[PDB]
């Protein structure tokens, strides 16, 4: 699981050498900025039951052709496991918020991205379009501060750049 701190111990493995000041101020930035990070995640857990019904149903507003069999949403059980899919999507962006590093992105969303729903015959275009609703869907004086929401935006758009 990659963090910042995991990268510099593996940098000290790649050196095979001692912890110098490569380490000793990356953590002090987390004294400022991970303290400035954590406050979003309570409404991220607080909106987690309701961001699904805007985003996935706006992808139904995007993609509504799904009645025909041989396609993805031919029954409503497929639709409530779409809800189950995107449930763990913002649950994982809750996770790569609180670690900082892209490990829960990489090994847990991106390891198995480029081929999986290709073979499972599902497009990632809705997987990027629901999160494309949540691009600027944030309010930096009003939802939370301007000190972590653009980073929260950077979290789930590195996700989409990985998905694209």
């Amino acid at each position: 699981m990659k963090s910042v701190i995991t990268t510099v111990v593996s940098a000290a493995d790649a050196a095979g050498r001692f912890p110098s000041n490569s380490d000793l101020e990356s953590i002090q930035g987390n004294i400022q900025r991970s303290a400035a990070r954590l406050e979003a995640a309570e409404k991220l857990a607080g909106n987690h039951e309701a961001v699904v019904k805007e985003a996935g149903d706006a992808c139904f507003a995007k993609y509504a052709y799904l009645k025909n069999p041989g396609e993805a949403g031919e029954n409503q059980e497929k639709i409530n496991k779409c809800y189950r899919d995107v449930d763990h999507y913002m649950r994982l962006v809750n996770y790569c918020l609180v670690v900082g590093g892209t490990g829960p992105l990489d090994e847990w969303g991106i390891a198995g991205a480029r081929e999986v729903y290709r073979t499972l015959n599902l497009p990632t275009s809705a997987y990027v379009a629901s999160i494309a609703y949540t691009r600027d869907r944030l309010c930096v004086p009003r939802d939370m501060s301007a000190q972590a929401g653009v980073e929260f935006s950077a979290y789930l758009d590195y996700l989409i750049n990985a998905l694209s």
């Binding site: 111990v9 912890p19 954590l38 609180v98 670690v99």
Partner: protein
């Protein structure tokens, strides 16, 4: 690998639960003493060659059994071995201390450690002497209770860090056992 910021995720998704305001009081009070951990760990990198020199010289102090001729560790090739065999685990316990997590030893350096050392024929009583006296010197060295090696800090309580490093030391002390 893994971290204290990561094993809070591995039990969260073991429950499919949140990470958030239930372990959060440990989380902000983890990073409240991050400068305190930095105040600890630069004392550890200060005398690492003195750490391993103290460890091996005390091992010849109350054990002459390794330096017995035809013994286990009586050659300079084997004192270069426990040069390495001390220093790289000192590197690794520094890695566990900077991670704040014990996930970087048994996967990393103790992948079947003592089985290979018994295949090398290393006696365990020398090993437990080595890790014990390096444990006692490292808890002497995270604080400022040296001979005169009196570095400057902000004063106060830091015994949470002593319970931290001793937990890593009996984790390695049991896993070498």
């Amino acid at each position: 690998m893994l971290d204290a910021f990561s094993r809070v995720v591995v039990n969260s998704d073991a429950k499919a639960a949140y990470v958030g305001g239930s372990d959060l009081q440990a989380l902000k009070s983890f990073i409240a003493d991050g400068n305190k951990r930095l105040d600890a760990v630069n004392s550890i990198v200060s005398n690492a060659s003195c750490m391993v020199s103290d460890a091996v010289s005390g091992m010849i102090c109350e054990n002459p059994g390794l330096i017995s001729p035809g013994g286990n560790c009586y050659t300079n090739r084997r004192m270069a071995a426990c040069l390495r065999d001390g220093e790289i685990i000192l590197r690794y316990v520094s890695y566990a201390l900077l991670a704040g997590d014990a996930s970087v030893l048994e996967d990393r350096c103790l992948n079947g450690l003592k089985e290979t050392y018994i295949a090398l024929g290393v006696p365990t009583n020398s090993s437990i002497r080595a890790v014990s006296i390096m444990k006692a010197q490292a808890v002497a060295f995270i604080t400022n209770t040296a001979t005169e090696r009196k570095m400057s800090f902000a004063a106060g309580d830091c015994t949470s860090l002593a319970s931290e490093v001793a937990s890593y030391f009996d984790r390695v002390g049991a896993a070498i056992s």
